[PDB]
Design a protein around this ligand. Structure first.
Ligand SMILES: O=C(c1ccccc1F)N1CCNCC1
Ligand SMILES: [Cl-]
Ligand SMILES: [Cl-]
Length: 163
């Protein structure tokens, strides 16, 4: 575990992360996809061998010795708000199980079901709070990656609020 487990946020490509493993905002079919998923495919394509997994689950595939945790958040275009909320919470619980199983001291993680799976809604707070609910009992250093300056500010505020 980390000596003093922390949350941090960085605004940059998660393919350039400085952590011991990465969480992919994956699709259920293990396809290259768009956004984070496409960046992850370009950097770690070997990790997409048998990475298909259902919504609300996470499946780890090693790229060399570097673990890629493929976490499938719901696409809110297809799910009701209630069912999507449940599957988004579940995906993050599976990420915490995998991070624990792997024995890593740090993990790079995007906010699941934002961007093209958001169903056109701002889900920063919903997605971040489900991330915290799952990861707070883990002792890995968590580094959240985002692309928007205003999201960086809001994630940073949410982290600092609870310290
Ligand atoms: O997830 C969203 C989003 C999607 C649909 C509606 C509002 C939104 F803030 N982001 C905004 C652009 N940067 C990526 C994060
Ligand atoms: Cl970058
Ligand atoms: Cl973002």
């Amino acid at each position: 575990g980390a000596m003093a487990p922390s949350y941090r946020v960085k605004r940059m490509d998660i393919a350039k992360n400085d952590e011991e493993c990465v969480v992919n905002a994956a699709n259920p079919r293990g396809l290259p996809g768009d956004g984070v998923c496409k960046a992850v495919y370009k950097k770690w394509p070997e990790s997409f061998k048998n990475s298909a997994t259902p919504v609300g689950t996470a499946k780890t595939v090693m790229c060399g010795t570097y673990p890629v945790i493929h976490a499938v958040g719901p696409n809110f275009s297809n799910y009701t708000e209630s069912e999507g909320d449940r599957e988004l919470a579940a995906a993050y619980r599976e990420v915490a199980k995998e991070v624990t199983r792997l024995g890593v001291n740090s993990v790079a993680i995007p906010l699941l079901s934002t961007g093209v799976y958001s169903g056109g809604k701002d889900r920063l707070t919903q997605s971040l709070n489900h991330l915290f609910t799952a990861m707070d009992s883990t002792d890995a250093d968590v580094v959240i990656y985002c692309r928007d300056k205003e999201w960086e500010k809001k994630i940073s505020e949410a982290i600092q609020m609870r310290t």
